[PDB]
Recover the amino acids of this structure.
């Protein structure tokens, strides 16, 4: 019918967007930050070495209480660790041993996990029976789950490999909203502190900002040469840093709609697995496939320090809600807490 | 002349290389493997036995140089007994390792359910107890003999009443060291070889070569000691009564004793260094040391 | 430590949980794990039935050995980004239908998939068990259509024993790491009740090789 | 096919919706980020070491 | 969750008795158990404790040796071997669950108990305090030692024993509201002086309030204060 006209309109929309983005690019973040003093050498020690897992560690999450953390391994069991005493709180035997993500609810009543099974497993930690049981199974996805996060309103935003992100209502077990637009497989989500907006990363080398209510992608970011692996929000929620298999992390600002600064090093060719921010946001921590975790100055990218307390891939990384300590998990079945 | 033509420099090289081998083997086994497998725990036990033997070796070197037994707290009892304890524990541990290899290669399906950590620990404790009890006869010297100012350790029993320890000192010292170990090793190795020859792989031949090399090394470096000690005990009386032949047989006995003590050094090599796992772990540890160093 | 607060029952529960975790890990390690591939292009369902909405797990015990198989038929996602999660499987069962040579042909797609998974670095040391299912159908079909339709470079007789041998050799030729990786190719049929024996032999050989590496002989 | 036409139409609608959105310049966003980072630099336990007295992870 | 005890009745002094308790819908394997006496003088006391898997067992100096606490996880039952009975042993026996981990609320359920008839110090300033519906009441208790452990927990537990009903937990380890109770209950303390307050009294808040420490065994129980309408 008018496919040629549609494609021409799309191309000139892309041109207009590029022109608008370039018009406001008066200067880069590097020039503005030239006068800021360096963060210096950031050195941390492995205060704790949590052990008990007998398989690869893939995901972990920090509870709002700053003490309890949950880790998911391929043994099919979730262990909640008391970081202050390297003590195990509960052991949750999972129906499926192929997990890929886990999350800790801010309220602390529920813990969620999932993976290749395509089913969300919601476990109730606080119950009168003591034993941990599955509350609801949020079935409906047509692909492997990659990341799940708990909204402050006791809701789960699910990321799956079928290119769809869904907002599930726990008590009804139904998809409240369906999100589409990513041509590639979705890997990581991150919700802002206010829970108003959140961004999703996919294998199409693009990051899309989805408003949980309007059902629309407010903004889209692109430029990466390979798949996206992890995304995290700046404490403000006005910017986010995304990792990619191309061994480069970059910072994007929602109010700028353009790349701010790129993190890369000649000696680093391994890809990134997880990315997290410090409470102040000055330090950017991201795990790499080179069996080590690197600390980057979010403002200048000086590579302030590096962590090498691991023997295999660093699969999961998470900063405490208060920024007191950083947890680094790896496929070696050991979790290291840094501070 | 007696007490002459000795070369204690020979023992220094074997001692130092034994340190460099056994210490590294034990460190790698304990640090990484965490002793979670039956073969690994047997290898660790063999490493500790060899380490004990080679750490008791130096005092013999000092005595050979001329340092008579005026040393204190190094009582001849424990020193003499430790040699036999180690030499018996190592043989028993090689036998157990061969048995474990046989079980794992002919009965892998059952070996999975049989190779338990508790069973390995129980077997190791039982073998240690048996070796210690075996060496009790050599623990009992009851004194250190003195004829001249040059003190020397006394024999197990005085020569005036040597007829009361015929069998234990004649046959039991060879049956448990030459006959039983070789018989068990052959009985296992034939089964392992026959089972491995059926595998459809190219690298299986490397296993055959390593098995043959281990068997040949053990035979070549243990048979001469057992035959020489047997000949020097009785053949020196029946036929080797001549002074020249007696001196030659004594020199051969010294040479075979030196050679046999070197077996402790090649045990860690042949049993741990072979296999990609050990090189992988050693390279990882070396990289870790370089990072810290 | 012994200087902690009165809540030492928490440490006791932690130790009990550690004991349970160790027992579960021992049980998992004792069990054999296999990966099944070829869904949507081969008679995988027939093999699964003989052995008898995401990954499917099948449990069966044979000759006092516990077998645990995973079906990844949900191939509607980027394989390279989740195949690595199966690093550690005892062996990989890859299913091919010999009747797909004439039906780019589907046999070429199966060959490309095998090359993709065979050469994957995550499966460098994991053996592959190859089953050529629907052998009777291919035997009947070869008498009507020459094998040259799928392999123009092929030259030889149209007899079953020749074409099957040629294709079996062709599949193995794609292995670029033959030194450290072995391929166990077998012919499978709906009426072949002894297919379990082939899998048992393959897993036994894999366990023997693992024991050889552990003992230092490999 | 109609599926391709529908996908192209949806893409065009999404692109035109995105284009209408405009926000502050890069310099203002960078300045705001720098100000926030400087303001909360004192509260970060990782940016600056922490005394051992107030219950760190030993 | 339900706990039922059995094995009561009259017993001659110096005899023996084997009290038993059973639970249903109860993870007995992962749950600990406590035994506490309730004498006719309304003074609660601690008897024995058995941890999960029978790993650790403790007895009070008054019941040492004579009592043997045992559990059978397959049967989900708890047993007491009682020997050498005396007159003072006449008291109602309660089985109390307990779980120990971060964020835990032990002693959250008390059984109906059974009656057996034989032929750190805690003090309360007020033996009783009259009250009326809708009134605010404050109660305080004192301890012989500072319960503020270095871990940052006051280890203060509050219970209510309504007439004819088993005690019910109110607070756990710091002013923390128990599950299933309204929000009108609150508490505070400094380490040695502890207080409990109720914003608005209701008809269901009539009973005896009990305070018990958990800093070190044996668990010593308070005398209790009775609330009169």
């Amino acid at each position: 019918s008018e496919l040629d006209q549609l494609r021409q309109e799309a191309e000139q929309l892309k041109n207009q967007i590029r022109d608008a983005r370039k018009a406001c690019a008066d200067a880069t973040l590097s020039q503005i930050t030239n006068n800021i003093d360096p963060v210096g050498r950031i050195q941390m020690r492995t205060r704790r070495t949590l052990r008990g897992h007998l398989a690869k560690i893939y995901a972990m999450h920090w509870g709002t209480d700053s003490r309890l953390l949950v880790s998911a391994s391929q043994d099919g069991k979730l262990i909640i660790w008391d970081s202050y005493t390297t003590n195990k709180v509960h052991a949750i035997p999972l129906r499926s041993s192929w997990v890929m993500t886990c999350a800790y609810a801010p309220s602390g009543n529920y813990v969620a996990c999932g993976g290749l099974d395509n089913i969300c497993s919601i476990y109730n930690l606080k119950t009168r029976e003591g034993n941990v049981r599955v509350s609801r199974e949020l079935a409906g996805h047509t692909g492997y789950l990659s990341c799940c996060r708990f909204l402050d309103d006791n809701q789960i935003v699910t990321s799956s490999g079928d290119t769809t992100c869904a907002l599930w209502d726990i008590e009804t077990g139904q998809q409240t909203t369906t999100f589409t637009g990513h041509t590639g497989d979705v890997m990581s989500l991150s919700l802002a502190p206010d829970t108003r907006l959140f961004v999703s990363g996919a294998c199409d080398a693009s990051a899309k900002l989805w408003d949980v209510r309007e059902g629309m992608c407010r903004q889209t970011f692109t430029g990466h040469e390979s798949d996206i692996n992890a995304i995290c929000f700046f404490p403000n929620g006005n910017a986010f840093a995304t990792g990619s298999d191309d061994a480069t992390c970059r910072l994007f600002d929602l109010r700028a709609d353009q790349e701010l600064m790129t993190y890369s090093h000649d000696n680093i060719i391994c890809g990134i697995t997880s990315v997290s921010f410090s409470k102040s946001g000055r330090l950017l921590l991201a795990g790499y496939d080179d069996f080590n975790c690197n600390v980057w100055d979010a403002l200048k990218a000086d590579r302030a320090g590096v962590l090498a307390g691991h023997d295999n891939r660093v699969s999961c990384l998470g900063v405490t809600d208060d920024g007191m300590a950083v947890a680094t998990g790896s496929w070696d079945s050991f979790l290291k807490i840094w501070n | 002349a007696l007490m002459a033509q000795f070369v204690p420099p020979l023992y220094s090289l074997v001692f130092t290389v034994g340190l460099l081998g056994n210490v590294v083997v034990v460190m790698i086994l304990i640090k990484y493997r965490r002793l979670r497998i039956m073969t690994n725990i047997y290898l660790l036990n063999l490493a500790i036995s060899d380490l004990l033997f080679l750490v008791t070796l130096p005092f013999w070197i000092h005595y050979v140089r001329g340092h008579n037994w005026v040393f204190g707290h190094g009582m001849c009892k424990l020193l003499s007994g430790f040699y036999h304890t180690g030499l018996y524990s190592e043989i028993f541990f090689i036998i157990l390792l061969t048995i474990d290899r046989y079980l794992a290669i002919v009965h892998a399906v059952f070996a999975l359910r049989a190779r338990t950590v508790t069973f390995g620990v129980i077997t190791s404790i039982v073998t240690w107890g048996l070796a210690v009890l075996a060496a009790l006869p050599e623990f009992i010297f009851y004194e250190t003999e003195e004829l001249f100012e040059e003190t020397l350790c006394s024999a197990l029993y005085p020569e005036d009443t040597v007829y009361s320890w015929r069998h234990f000192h004649t046959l039991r010292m060879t049956i448990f060291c030459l006959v039983l170990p070789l018989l068990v090793m052959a009985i296992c190795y034939t089964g392992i070889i026959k089972t491995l020859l059926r595998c459809p792989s190219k690298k299986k031949y490397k296993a055959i070569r390593l098995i043959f090399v281990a068997m040949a090394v053990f035979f070549i470096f243990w048979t001469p000691y057992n035959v020489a000690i047997l000949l020097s005990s009785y053949q020196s009386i029946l036929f080797g009564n001549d002074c020249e032949r007696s001196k030659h047989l004594d020199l051969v006995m010294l040479v075979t004793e030196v050679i046999a003590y070197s077996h402790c050094c090649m045990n860690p090599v042949i049993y741990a260094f072979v296999g990609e796992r050990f090189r992988k772990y050693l390279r990882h540890f070396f990289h870790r040391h370089l990072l810290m160093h | 430590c012994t200087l902690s607060a009165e809540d030492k029952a928490a440490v006791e529960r932690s130790k009990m949980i550690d004991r349970n975790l160790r027992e579960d890990g021992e049980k998992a390690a004792r069990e054999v794990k296999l990966l099944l591939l070829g869904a949507g292009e081969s008679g995988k369902n027939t093999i699964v039935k003989q052995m008898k909405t995401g990954i499917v797990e099948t449990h069966f015990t044979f000759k006092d050995l516990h077998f645990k198989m995973f079906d990844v038929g949900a191939q509607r996602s980027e394989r390279k980004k989740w195949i690595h999660c199966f690093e550690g499987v005892t062996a990989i069962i890859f299913c091919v239908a010999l009747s797909d040579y004439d039906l780019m042909n589907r046999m070429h797609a199966s060959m490309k998939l095998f090359d993709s998974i065979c050469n994957n670095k995550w499966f460098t040391d994991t053996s592959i068990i190859l089953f050529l299912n629907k052998k009777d159908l291919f035997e009947e079909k070869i008498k009507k259509s020459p094998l040259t339709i799928c392999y123009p470079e092929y030259a030889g007789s149209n007899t079953y024993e020749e074409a099957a041998a040629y294709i079996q050799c062709q599949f193995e030729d794609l292995n670029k790491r033959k030194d450290t990786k072995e391929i166990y190719t077998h012919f499978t049929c709906s009426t072949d009740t002894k297919n379990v024996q082939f899998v048992f032999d393959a897993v036994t050989d894999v366990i023997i090789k693992n024991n050889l590496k552990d003992c230092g002989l490999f | 096919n109609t599926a391709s036409i529908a996908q192209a139409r949806k893409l065009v609608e999404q692109l035109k919706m995105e284009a209408n959105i405009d926000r502050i310049k890069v310099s203002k966003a960078a300045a705001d980020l720098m100000a926030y980072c400087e303001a909360h630099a004192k509260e970060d336990p990782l940016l600056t070491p922490v005394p051992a007295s107030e219950n760190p992870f030993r | 969750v339900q706990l039922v005890e059995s094995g009561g009745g009259l017993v001659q002094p110096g005899g023996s008795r084997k009290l038993s308790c059973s639970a249903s819908g109860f993870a007995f394997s992962s749950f600990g158990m406590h035994w506490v006496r309730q004498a006719p003088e309304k003074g609660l006391e601690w008897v024995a404790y058995i941890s999960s898997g029978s790993g650790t067992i403790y007895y009070a100096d008054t019941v040492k040796g004579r009592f043997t606490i045992s559990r059978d996880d397959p049967k989900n039952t708890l047993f007491l071997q009682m020997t050498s009975l005396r007159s003072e042993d006449t008291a109602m026996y309660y089985c109390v669950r307990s779980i120990y981990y971060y964020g835990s609320s032990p002693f959250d359920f008390w059984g109906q108990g059974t009656t057996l008839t034989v032929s750190i110090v805690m003090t309360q300033a007020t033996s009783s305090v009259p009250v009326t519906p809708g009134e605010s009441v404050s109660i305080s208790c004192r301890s012989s030692k500072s319960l503020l452990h270095s871990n940052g927990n006051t280890y203060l537990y509050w219970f209510l024993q309504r007439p004819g009903q088993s005690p019910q937990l109110l607070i756990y380890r710091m002013s923390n509201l128990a599950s299933g109770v309204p929000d009108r209950f609150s508490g505070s303390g400094s380490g040695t002086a502890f207080t409990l307050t109720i914003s608005r009294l209701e008809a269901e808040d009539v009973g005896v309030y009990y305070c018990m420490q958990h800093l070190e065994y044996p668990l010593t129980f308070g005398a209790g204060t009775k609330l009169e309408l």
Observations:
- The first strand of chain A starts at residue 46 and ends at 50.
- Chain A has two helices and 28 strands.
- Helices of chain A lie at 3-23, 29-32.
